């Protein structure tokens, strides 16, 4: 998975010990002790899997670590467990109702593991002999590290091998039941033992994936095209009852996951009303909601609310609150960011960055590191010194300074009333 550097690449975990007590700086996370402790409690609840339909609200001031906390929870939760992260603005679609979009998001975060035991023969082919009707007579020889035997083919196997046009001397894989043939290069690699092996393959799917697969004749393309449409509720009921029966039979297990809505303050009252009931039912994942606004008017309503959310939903949620950082934590977060971005800052440069971040914003100081690095490279210098950061500060403006400039020159910008003085004279 090759990709560039993001703003959350350094957070490789939640940084807890055995007793769920977070360390001062571990797994890329700094500070936020109580928030990380509560996030570890949530993570343990997710791993247990015995608790369903819990909503946790991650509230606090901006640039405090809500998305960082969610990313740490996701990484510590690891793979092999669903984690759906959708912004609140992704629900509003022209093809799916908001309730249907929320339902699909809810189903995406509940995983189902199905084990399929397949009999497949793997080895290095040697000879193939196919003859005309005397329907068809055929013999193939497969060599491995310790066996070399011939196989008497039948009609359909001969047809399949002719369709694949398998050559000789190339590693081949044939499935006894399905009949699929997977080609491989000449034996770096080599056959490793018995001709016919018994290895199980596990398929990880979500409830939404099963719903879409059964939705149409070839619905599994919609998982990529996105033209699923509002699935009939009877189909979902069928999926649910069959998943219950499979779990009872023991031929499939359920892996509950986490659904993360980053900007819940954009969902309307209908979405919250739907969420209230969707949480109650079984197969409901754990919903993490991140909000920042203190008291705002819920979208679709004309009244204020304690977080931009209706009181019914807040009654159903437990709130994890994040607190603003101080100078030392800003310093160590910037050091981690600089190490991630492969930038060697000096001590005085780091101190200047820390004071700038405390005065203005942590994100502003975080973004200045790469610009400072590029400025230094223009001077053919390796380490970023104070003057490079000062030039970066002079060239690029923050929110407060930009606001001050706009306020002091309000005539030359377009205002809310649509007035501007383009003419430099008069």
């Amino acid at each position: 998975s090759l990709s560039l550097i993001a703003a959350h690449s350094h957070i490789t975990g939640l940084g807890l010990d055995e007793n769920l007590q977070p360390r001062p700086t571990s797994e890329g996370m700094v500070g936020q002790l109580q928030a990380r402790r509560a996030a570890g409690v949530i993570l343990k609840m997710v791993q247990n899997g015995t608790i369903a339909g819990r909503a946790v609200l991650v509230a606090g001031p901006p640039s405090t670590g809500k998305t960082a906390l969610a990313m740490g929870v996701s990484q510590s939760l690891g793979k092999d467990v669903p984690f759906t992260a959708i912004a609140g603005s992704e629900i509003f679609s022209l093809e799916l109702s908001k309730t249907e979009a929320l339902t699909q998001a809810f189903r995406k975060s509940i995983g189902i593991k199905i084990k399929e035991e397949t009999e497949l023969i793997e080895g290095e082919v040697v000879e193939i002999q196919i003859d005309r009707s005397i329907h068809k007579q055929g013999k193939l020889t497969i060599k491995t590290t310790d066996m070399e035997t011939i196989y008497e083919l039948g009609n359909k196997m001969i047809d399949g091998l002719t369709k694949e046009k398998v050559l000789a001397g190339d590693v081949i894989s044939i499935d006894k039941a399905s009949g699929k043939i997977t080609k491989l290069g000449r034996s770096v690699q080599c056959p490793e033992g018995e001709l016919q092996k018994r290895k199980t393959v596990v398929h990880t799917v979500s409830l939404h994936e099963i719903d879409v697969i059964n939705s149409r004749t070839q619905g599994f393309l919609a998982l990529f095209t996105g033209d699923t449409g509002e699935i009939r509720s009877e189909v979902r009921d069928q999926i649910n009852t069959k998943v219950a029966e499979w779990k009872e039979e023991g031929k499939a297990e359920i892996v509950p996951g986490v659904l993360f809505i980053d900007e819940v303050h954009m969902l309307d009252i209908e979405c919250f009303s739907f969420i209230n009931r969707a949480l109650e039912d079984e197969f409901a994942p754990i919903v993490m909601m991140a909000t920042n606004r203190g008291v705002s008017k819920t979208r679709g309503t004309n009244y204020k609310s304690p977080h931009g959310l209706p009181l019914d939903l807040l009654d159903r949620s437990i709130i994890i609150t994040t607190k603003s950082y101080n100078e030392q934590e800003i310093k160590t977060i910037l050091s981690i960011r600089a190490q991630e971005e492969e930038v060697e800052l000096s001590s005085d440069a780091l101190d200047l960055l820390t004071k700038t971040g405390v005065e203005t914003s942590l994100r502003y100081s975080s973004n200045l590191i790469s610009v400072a690095q590029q400025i230094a490279m223009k001077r053919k210098n390796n380490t970023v010194e104070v003057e490079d950061v000062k030039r970066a500060y002079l060239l690029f403006l923050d929110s407060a300074r930009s606001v001050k400039y706009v306020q002091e020159n309000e005539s030359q910008y377009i205002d809310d009333q649509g007035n501007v003085q383009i003419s430099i004279a008069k």
Binding site: T141, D146, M147, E148, T149, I150, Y151, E194, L195, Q196
Partner: protein, 70 residues
Amino acid sequence: FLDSALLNLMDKNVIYHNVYNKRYFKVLPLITTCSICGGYDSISSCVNCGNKICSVSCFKLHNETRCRNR
């Protein structure tokens, strides 16, 4: 006694040939098993003589002691 001329042709026919099956030769399915251990899960024919084996251990056993044509 069998070679004795006192046993007539039709008597010999009824005593030995007639009692055997003559019409139904195989009504049950044909089951092929490993020549070494009788297994059936996996079957393959040895390259040398065309007899059936099932596993690497049976392969070595057949090659070392059972293979006739080599």
